[PDB]
Amino acid sequence: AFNMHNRNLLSLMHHSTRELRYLLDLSRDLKRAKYTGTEQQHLKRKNIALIFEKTSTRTRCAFEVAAYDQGANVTYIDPNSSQIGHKESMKDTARVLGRMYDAIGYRGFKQEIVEELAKFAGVPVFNGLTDEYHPTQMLADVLTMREHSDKPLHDISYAYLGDARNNMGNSLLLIGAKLGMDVRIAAPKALWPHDEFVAQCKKFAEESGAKLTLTEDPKEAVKGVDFVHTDVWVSMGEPVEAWGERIKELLPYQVNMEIMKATGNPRAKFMHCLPAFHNSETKVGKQIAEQYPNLANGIEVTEDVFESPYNIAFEQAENRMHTIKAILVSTLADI
Amino acid sequence: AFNMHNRNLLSLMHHSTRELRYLLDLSRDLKRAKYTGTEQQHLKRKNIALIFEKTSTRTRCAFEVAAYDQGANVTYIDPNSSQIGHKESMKDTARVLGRMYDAIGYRGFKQEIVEELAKFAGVPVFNGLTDEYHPTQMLADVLTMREHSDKPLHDISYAYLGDARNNMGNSLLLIGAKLGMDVRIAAPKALWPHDEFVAQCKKFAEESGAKLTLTEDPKEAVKGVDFVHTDVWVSMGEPVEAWGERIKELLPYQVNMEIMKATGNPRAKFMHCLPAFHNSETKVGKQIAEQYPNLANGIEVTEDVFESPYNIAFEQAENRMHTIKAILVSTLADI
Amino acid sequence: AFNMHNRNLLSLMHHSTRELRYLLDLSRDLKRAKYTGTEQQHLKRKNIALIFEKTSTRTRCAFEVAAYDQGANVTYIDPNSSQIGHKESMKDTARVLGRMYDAIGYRGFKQEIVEELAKFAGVPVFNGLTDEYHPTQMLADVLTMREHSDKPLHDISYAYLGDARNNMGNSLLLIGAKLGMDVRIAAPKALWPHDEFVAQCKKFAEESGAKLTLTEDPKEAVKGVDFVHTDVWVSMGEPVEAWGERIKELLPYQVNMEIMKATGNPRAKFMHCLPAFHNSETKVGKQIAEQYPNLANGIEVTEDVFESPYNIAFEQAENRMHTIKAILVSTLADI
Amino acid sequence: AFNMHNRNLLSLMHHSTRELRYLLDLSRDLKRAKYTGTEQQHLKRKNIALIFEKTSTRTRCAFEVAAYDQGANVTYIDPNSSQIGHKESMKDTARVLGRMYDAIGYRGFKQEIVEELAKFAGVPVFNGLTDEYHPTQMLADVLTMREHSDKPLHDISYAYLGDARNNMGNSLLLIGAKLGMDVRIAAPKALWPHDEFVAQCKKFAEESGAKLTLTEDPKEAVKGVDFVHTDVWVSMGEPVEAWGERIKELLPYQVNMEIMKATGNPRAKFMHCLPAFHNSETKVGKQIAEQYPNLANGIEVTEDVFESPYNIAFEQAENRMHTIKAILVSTLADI
Amino acid sequence: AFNMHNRNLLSLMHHSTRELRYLLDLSRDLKRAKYTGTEQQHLKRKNIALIFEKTSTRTRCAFEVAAYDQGANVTYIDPNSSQIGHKESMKDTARVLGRMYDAIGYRGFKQEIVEELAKFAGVPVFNGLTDEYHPTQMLADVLTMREHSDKPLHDISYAYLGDARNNMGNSLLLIGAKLGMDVRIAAPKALWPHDEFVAQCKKFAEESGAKLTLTEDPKEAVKGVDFVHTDVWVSMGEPVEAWGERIKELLPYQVNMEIMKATGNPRAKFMHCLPAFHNSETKVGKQIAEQYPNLANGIEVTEDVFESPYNIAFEQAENRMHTIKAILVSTLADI
Amino acid sequence: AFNMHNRNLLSLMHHSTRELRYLLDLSRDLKRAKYTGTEQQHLKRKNIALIFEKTSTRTRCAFEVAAYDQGANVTYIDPNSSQIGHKESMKDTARVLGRMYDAIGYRGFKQEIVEELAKFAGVPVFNGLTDEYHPTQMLADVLTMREHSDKPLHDISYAYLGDARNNMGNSLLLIGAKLGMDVRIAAPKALWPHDEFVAQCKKFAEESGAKLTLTEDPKEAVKGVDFVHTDVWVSMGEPVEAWGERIKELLPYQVNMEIMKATGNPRAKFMHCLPAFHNSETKVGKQIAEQYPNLANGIEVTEDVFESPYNIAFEQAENRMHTIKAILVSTLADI
């Protein structure tokens, strides 16, 4: 053994550097097993339910392909007709569904609800995700930094550029800290993680040899790094008429061929957990491009970087499937 | 043999006490087979279609898990985009779909349509359900009364409290009558099954030794019973402003710790084919709780009974999966 | 070998009479394999994604049953929540999805998009269909004409009646031309395929011995044919108030028992790639029947032909599943 | 273990209430295993021989189907050409046949011969039966009384009506006595089992709580019983001209709707180990009906009971197959 | 699907040209599957009973080999000791036997009895045959005409010579009519099918393009046909002393090398559903040969045709096994 | 290879000492394979037909068990209803039966018929036997002499006592001659094999080192032999009243404890291909015992030898099954 058999993965802020390393070694070896055809199905006859409150195709397909490779079966239950709070309640419908399913994947907004599901279901609940966010895109990215750089975890350094609050900034700092990598965040001080959370990331960062800068100067943050990360900072919905101040703020932190070449090294790569606003060929992306001519070519990533080889965003998007398979196999599988 | 191979289960009012007993022995033994891992897949390579006109997750998941345990495969076809009466017609689309599928599950409102499907499809049609209602929650409940009480079918007595017209009242009386159990209904006379149907249930009740009371006095109806059943009587939609008279009527028939203790026996259990309005933690359930302070704690079941061990509603909800598996295995399977 | 392993079928206007014959021999033999139980699963452990921009149940079920018989697994991705052009772009989401899936089925309006998918996905893309339309209902129909008539392809003649522009008219002429059958189109000259396309169909028609008439006289077109084809010519949406001129035009081309008996032969059959407006028992079909009393019994096919044995429309509808299985097995399968 | 591996079942008058209960639990569970498809073949590669001196189709088919479900193979050897006493001798041909077969089924008249076979064969000999009669219709019937009444063995009571000497009367009293059921025999005193055998059945009846009446009054015997048993009392052959006195004797003991309603209870059932003279539609049954107009509608069972739902004679006839399978699996099978 | 799952084949005068074509395509493909070793067993663990009232080896062996290739198991029950009408009744013994078997094959004289069996058994009853006769030698012969001529069904013409009343004459006309072949009967007018049956065969013959002559002139009937059929017209039993008038009647209709060469074509073949009186080397055939010197070389077929290559009677006799396998696989098998 | 694949064994007088040795090594090793459970089934999916004109249970069971161990399937066709010469002819029914079966076993009187079967069937014909007699009891006995004595074939000597004409006498001399054993026949000169056949057995006896005496003195013939053989010499049927001269002739050649002790050696064994008239406990054996008091204890073998350990007649009777399995596996099996 040395197992985490039956453990929910409902978003963990709590996990040994030892469990996190077990979980990434297992996804590394399950990726290699698929490719080589050495993969054996250890979830045959297991049926999982997938309750998604927001539609999220890339996370549904990752659960669906991972569950299927391992012989499991999947019931996708929508946003359109899982009228959850309507007339039923997560507590009452998790109790019915842990009686028919073997594990449950959840993806909604309100992490508070994930906890009811996890509490009452009676069977592994895997938070695919919520706002509070992601355990698995966390381990997908570091699975990606590790296989591509071909260096031990602790000789990988990377930077995150701007709005380290929309929490890909927090989740990258959290895992760089527990695994002892060299993580640098580059955002304007109004947008750093709140300092009690950086205080935690420093508690962690000390037990491992982790280095954490937090600057506001991109060219610095990104110096000699392997892997530059960014993420869409404009909030679709807070209308659009005048993203203007937000756009004036983060537009220095635009990952672009100056920032990429600004890193020291010809092997630095760009990563982004998609969708990336990187040109006008989308309907959101023509709106913005009208009201802002100088975007219309990439808001937080320019096409001059997105569509040419600094970009491993799709190999990283795939790696999210090999991680959810690491989570279904150490929770469920007969090993 | 002794089979009902190829027989549609499209809602049967017609079935031998002998077929009903075959069908409950088979679900009893298929439940035990899952648990023990003695279950063999006898529907491998069978694909069933599931046309649902109203969304019903608990009945979709029961079809889906049952079909999957037995190696079958399922195509779920929505309410959103099975524009059935629109430009096609059940008669024309059942003829196309019996050519690609092996059996079809249906769940719509209008039992009249189930019959077209059953008539023209060319392949087993299983009425998951309609308004005319349920063959399988009928056999799920008596599968539940029988395994929990550990008594022969004929030494199980149970009561149904109020609005024995919204037909869980009819379906419980119908099957208590054919299997010779002791079934008591407790509702105000304006809400009894119409008497030609009780006349039928008495025809039946005589061939078996079945006892049928129909009172309006709860404490009587429920005396010395095993299993007390109820069901939501407020009709979501007939607006809400003033359920008042309905609420003044059925509120004496509220299953609650007086009614439960009112039964004679410390082993009586409560059953309900979910959703049960049993507190305000739902959005329908905050509406009502505002307009009616004295509900806001359970309309037809109080939380003082729902959330503490008189309640086997979830073991009964699971038992609906082991019954639909009894119906796919005696219709389809190679045995 | 002699394979088309890895070849996308994204709608081919380009294909050898040799590949088309390989593809119909394979669906013929895969139909027979299912029926006889000689079918072996050669797609086990293959997962395909099905992105449908318009809901199309009959084409989803054909992909779903074909993929399943062969052991594959299917992720259906809706119209409701594949907000494709919204904030992502086919080019970016095909690159993510060819990393998790093994092949992709597509069905949208805009053939232009199918090409992005096919270009960037990295894995077989099968156009289930678009407006530009169908490779597989093309081979389903000729699979149907060939097995039912029991004659070699070149001794099958058939007619298409009216509006040979709504392209079932073009696709029937295209394949009658490449396979050397005797194809006759019967429509008013304002509605013939545009003559540069008939010029192509004649280039083709010469290399094979194909005969192509194009008349405006039904009784002529249909003389001594095996198989009479038609299709709904009223465009649901271009309002309805006054289909009148369209209805006055094509109403001579109504396939009906005069046209069917007008063929020479007691074995002529009617075919139609469903839905067929053939009576009022539908909600579109009561609208029209009100505004047009003399339809209300079949717009392009009368019930006097649709519902009685000249009609093989459902055996042809099934044959669409055995063709998509011929396309998944020569693209994907390990043979 | 706890096995009776290798034990002949050549008709046992000697068997623990413990072995008899093992043998009926095993046939109960092997019935359920067939129905559920949980049955595994534990006699693969075992060949049994079936020497039948009188033709008996219902007992051959029960051996044949039971042996086959379990993967064994069967050689049926006739009455027509097993000229046994002719020029060979059971002792000499059992020694040859235990060298080629794995077990032997026997059915002849003379129980004395069964013993030679059992003594010299060298391999399990299962007495299918002789005049001395049946071990397996004994356990088939009580397997039937037990599953149908759904009561523990000791709360089942039953009656046998008239000629408790033609030994279905003895075999029912013998097993009611060892298993502690409530067995009542109803026959005229000239036709009771001989009293030293009732003395044995009382020795037995005391160790278990068994009640044994022996009356001559049907309406009494049958009072409040579950299951009324009878059997053909006219001996085909002792000519026919004048069965008259026999017919005047047992004709009060005719099971008929007075006797069936005479039992207390609406669930009493009739059982009979077929053939049952129950009407004239047979050639023996037209003979008798001529010489006796008032029979010609059922000699020991009237059609008014045989052909309408008090009659479980065919479910009991099937249960004879699940018992012979309990006997081949505890003798032979690798468990 | 498109199945006839569970359908008895107890002799059908009622069957779609569509079911008959399904049934012959399936036997065609099951013949090819045996030869090629592509055959999979889809009746494993199915046991069928074969009640034969007249001994018929060629029909027993065809059931037995077909049932065995598909993994089923067979209990043959004789004429010698199935004393059916004796003391039991088909209605009572079918109810016992549908409880142990999975399907039942029957072959007796009295079609009236087949119907009781089919009505009460509870499991597929396949009429192997009766006097009313054969569904399967009907489809064996047309399976034979179709594979040997290599022409579509409708380009096969054949003739039947004399005594088109002994119903091979009726069954050949019936199926030539439903499948649209060109069927000619050649018998003296006293021996034509009775005209209300030819009136039926003409109803049928019109919906398909079937041609039916009925002449009394052999050389005409047989002109340019593929396949000449005949059958023994002397009734063994209506003594023998003086078959004389029968022999003077049908002796012009003797299929012989004049009639065979009288057909137009060097590929015409002779067919006969054996036994064929075609020489004296039999004990019936020496009797007749004495009393009739000029027979003694072939009564309805001369040895000059029977024993030299116009004769496909044995390939047709085999084809009766591949048809009964088409009937066990579409009734029983898990496909 | 080195095979006799497809070779009929229809009784061979022609066979290399090399094929006979191959055939006995193979039955030796197939006996050992059964016992050890090293036996693999190499006849799976092979069906053989068994046409028996005289009933012969011991030879049917040997074919049946051998065919079954190897996965084959068997159709037994009787004497009662294979009315062979009646109205059909071996030549015509072998042609039908080689089309459905894979090999055919035959056992009739008239070896002349075996040859028609073998000539026309088209598939291996194994003469189980005829009057002309046995290839397999020949190799069963020498398989028995060889395993029991544990000596090489050529150091086994044996004697046959009286009526070396009823051809067990010829078949023992024939095989002792080809395999070079020491074979002695002991019968009165009126009953020796006819001398042209002994002339053949001497041709043979010289190429191998075979010794052949033919004496009329038992005590001599049997001196120092291993294995003493005899066989019933009274012909049941040539009435019985006065077997007297036959009984006075062969009664000196009675194998009995004088003859057995008369051999030199304490390991000599008696063999007999059963039935052996060895006492009165049979109905033929009480007839004779009345008319001949001094028999009534064993005509050609006395019970003082038959029923006590000089007697290996039943191990030899079993060995007939392991030989017919050597013949089905070298003819049919995929090795």
mmCIF file of C-alpha atoms in Angstrom, chain F residues 59-174:
data_model
loop_
_atom_site.group_PDB
_atom_site.id
_atom_site.type_symbol
_atom_site.label_atom_id
_atom_site.label_comp_id
_atom_site.label_asym_id
_atom_site.label_seq_id
_atom_site.Cartn_x
_atom_site.Cartn_y
_atom_site.Cartn_z
ATOM 1 C CA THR F 59 -19.943 -49.626 -28.474
ATOM 2 C CA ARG F 60 -22.267 -46.663 -28.525
ATOM 3 C CA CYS F 61 -21.038 -45.543 -25.023
ATOM 4 C CA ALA F 62 -17.392 -45.922 -26.107
ATOM 5 C CA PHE F 63 -18.033 -43.676 -29.176
ATOM 6 C CA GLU F 64 -20.129 -41.296 -27.131
ATOM 7 C CA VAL F 65 -17.666 -40.812 -24.190
ATOM 8 C CA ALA F 66 -14.640 -40.580 -26.578
ATOM 9 C CA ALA F 67 -16.302 -38.049 -28.822
ATOM 10 C CA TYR F 68 -17.386 -36.037 -25.775
ATOM 11 C CA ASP F 69 -14.072 -35.898 -23.977
ATOM 12 C CA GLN F 70 -12.635 -34.317 -27.049
ATOM 13 C CA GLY F 71 -15.363 -31.634 -27.276
ATOM 14 C CA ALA F 72 -17.263 -33.270 -30.260
ATOM 15 C CA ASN F 73 -21.042 -33.770 -30.422
ATOM 16 C CA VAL F 74 -22.874 -36.975 -31.317
ATOM 17 C CA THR F 75 -26.251 -37.731 -33.017
ATOM 18 C CA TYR F 76 -27.231 -41.368 -32.202
ATOM 19 C CA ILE F 77 -29.458 -42.812 -34.970
ATOM 20 C CA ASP F 78 -31.071 -46.132 -34.005
ATOM 21 C CA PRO F 79 -32.002 -49.502 -35.250
ATOM 22 C CA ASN F 80 -35.670 -48.527 -34.569
ATOM 23 C CA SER F 81 -35.826 -45.661 -37.053
ATOM 24 C CA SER F 82 -33.159 -45.531 -39.610
ATOM 25 C CA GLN F 83 -35.278 -47.577 -42.025
ATOM 26 C CA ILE F 84 -32.168 -47.750 -44.261
ATOM 27 C CA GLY F 85 -32.814 -50.242 -47.037
ATOM 28 C CA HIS F 86 -36.540 -49.454 -46.737
ATOM 29 C CA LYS F 87 -37.111 -46.548 -49.028
ATOM 30 C CA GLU F 88 -33.772 -44.804 -49.135
ATOM 31 C CA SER F 89 -30.368 -46.647 -49.605
ATOM 32 C CA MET F 90 -27.074 -46.126 -47.840
ATOM 33 C CA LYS F 91 -25.667 -44.437 -50.965
ATOM 34 C CA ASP F 92 -28.358 -41.745 -50.858
ATOM 35 C CA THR F 93 -28.452 -41.201 -47.160
ATOM 36 C CA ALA F 94 -24.577 -41.083 -46.734
ATOM 37 C CA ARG F 95 -24.539 -38.270 -49.280
ATOM 38 C CA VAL F 96 -27.049 -36.307 -47.247
ATOM 39 C CA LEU F 97 -25.357 -37.077 -43.918
ATOM 40 C CA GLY F 98 -21.727 -36.219 -44.988
ATOM 41 C CA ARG F 99 -23.135 -32.788 -45.703
ATOM 42 C CA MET F 100 -24.311 -32.233 -42.179
ATOM 43 C CA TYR F 101 -21.847 -34.338 -40.100
ATOM 44 C CA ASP F 102 -18.063 -34.367 -39.785
ATOM 45 C CA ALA F 103 -17.435 -38.103 -39.506
ATOM 46 C CA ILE F 104 -19.906 -41.076 -39.230
ATOM 47 C CA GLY F 105 -19.729 -44.154 -36.960
ATOM 48 C CA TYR F 106 -21.325 -47.282 -38.264
ATOM 49 C CA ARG F 107 -22.402 -50.499 -36.775
ATOM 50 C CA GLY F 108 -24.490 -52.918 -38.667
ATOM 51 C CA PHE F 109 -24.240 -56.491 -39.700
ATOM 52 C CA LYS F 110 -23.463 -56.357 -43.311
ATOM 53 C CA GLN F 111 -19.862 -55.048 -43.903
ATOM 54 C CA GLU F 112 -20.886 -54.799 -47.597
ATOM 55 C CA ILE F 113 -23.090 -51.697 -46.533
ATOM 56 C CA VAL F 114 -20.234 -50.084 -44.484
ATOM 57 C CA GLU F 115 -18.383 -49.873 -47.772
ATOM 58 C CA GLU F 116 -21.226 -47.868 -49.481
ATOM 59 C CA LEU F 117 -21.257 -45.483 -46.569
ATOM 60 C CA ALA F 118 -17.500 -45.155 -46.694
ATOM 61 C CA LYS F 119 -17.551 -44.726 -50.457
ATOM 62 C CA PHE F 120 -20.218 -42.013 -50.830
ATOM 63 C CA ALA F 121 -20.366 -40.156 -47.496
ATOM 64 C CA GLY F 122 -17.554 -37.688 -48.291
ATOM 65 C CA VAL F 123 -16.345 -37.556 -44.677
ATOM 66 C CA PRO F 124 -14.400 -40.123 -42.383
ATOM 67 C CA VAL F 125 -16.453 -43.261 -41.836
ATOM 68 C CA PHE F 126 -15.422 -45.298 -38.824
ATOM 69 C CA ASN F 127 -16.638 -48.764 -38.779
ATOM 70 C CA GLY F 128 -17.577 -49.191 -35.136
ATOM 71 C CA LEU F 129 -18.209 -52.794 -36.491
ATOM 72 C CA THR F 130 -19.977 -55.516 -38.530
ATOM 73 C CA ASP F 131 -19.811 -59.394 -38.712
ATOM 74 C CA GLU F 132 -16.565 -59.148 -40.685
ATOM 75 C CA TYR F 133 -15.660 -57.348 -37.483
ATOM 76 C CA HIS F 134 -13.428 -55.212 -35.502
ATOM 77 C CA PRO F 135 -10.448 -53.120 -35.974
ATOM 78 C CA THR F 136 -10.990 -51.479 -32.488
ATOM 79 C CA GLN F 137 -11.562 -54.381 -30.093
ATOM 80 C CA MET F 138 -8.365 -55.664 -31.822
ATOM 81 C CA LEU F 139 -6.307 -52.663 -30.705
ATOM 82 C CA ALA F 140 -8.163 -52.416 -27.314
ATOM 83 C CA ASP F 141 -6.999 -55.917 -26.347
ATOM 84 C CA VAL F 142 -3.460 -55.469 -27.417
ATOM 85 C CA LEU F 143 -3.507 -51.986 -25.679
ATOM 86 C CA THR F 144 -4.594 -54.092 -22.673
ATOM 87 C CA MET F 145 -2.024 -56.810 -22.984
ATOM 88 C CA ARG F 146 0.669 -54.231 -23.315
ATOM 89 C CA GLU F 147 -0.075 -52.061 -20.329
ATOM 90 C CA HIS F 148 -0.819 -54.725 -17.923
ATOM 91 C CA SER F 149 2.154 -56.984 -18.656
ATOM 92 C CA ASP F 150 4.521 -53.984 -18.786
ATOM 93 C CA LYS F 151 6.616 -55.905 -21.379
ATOM 94 C CA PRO F 152 7.439 -54.714 -25.003
ATOM 95 C CA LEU F 153 4.765 -55.925 -27.540
ATOM 96 C CA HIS F 154 7.018 -58.823 -28.740
ATOM 97 C CA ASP F 155 7.416 -60.380 -25.234
ATOM 98 C CA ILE F 156 3.708 -60.858 -24.770
ATOM 99 C CA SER F 157 2.253 -64.210 -25.544
ATOM 100 C CA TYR F 158 -1.409 -65.154 -25.236
ATOM 101 C CA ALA F 159 -3.843 -67.997 -26.147
ATOM 102 C CA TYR F 160 -7.355 -68.111 -27.531
ATOM 103 C CA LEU F 161 -9.481 -71.118 -26.511
ATOM 104 C CA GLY F 162 -11.863 -72.675 -28.899
ATOM 105 C CA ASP F 163 -13.810 -71.839 -31.963
ATOM 106 C CA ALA F 164 -11.132 -69.908 -33.579
ATOM 107 C CA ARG F 165 -13.613 -69.164 -36.434
ATOM 108 C CA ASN F 166 -16.208 -66.941 -34.793
ATOM 109 C CA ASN F 167 -13.576 -64.429 -35.650
ATOM 110 C CA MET F 168 -12.216 -63.120 -32.326
ATOM 111 C CA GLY F 169 -9.994 -66.108 -33.114
ATOM 112 C CA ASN F 170 -9.075 -64.528 -36.472
ATOM 113 C CA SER F 171 -8.645 -61.054 -35.238
ATOM 114 C CA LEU F 172 -6.431 -62.127 -32.367
ATOM 115 C CA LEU F 173 -4.220 -64.190 -34.763
ATOM 116 C CA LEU F 174 -4.130 -61.298 -37.286
#
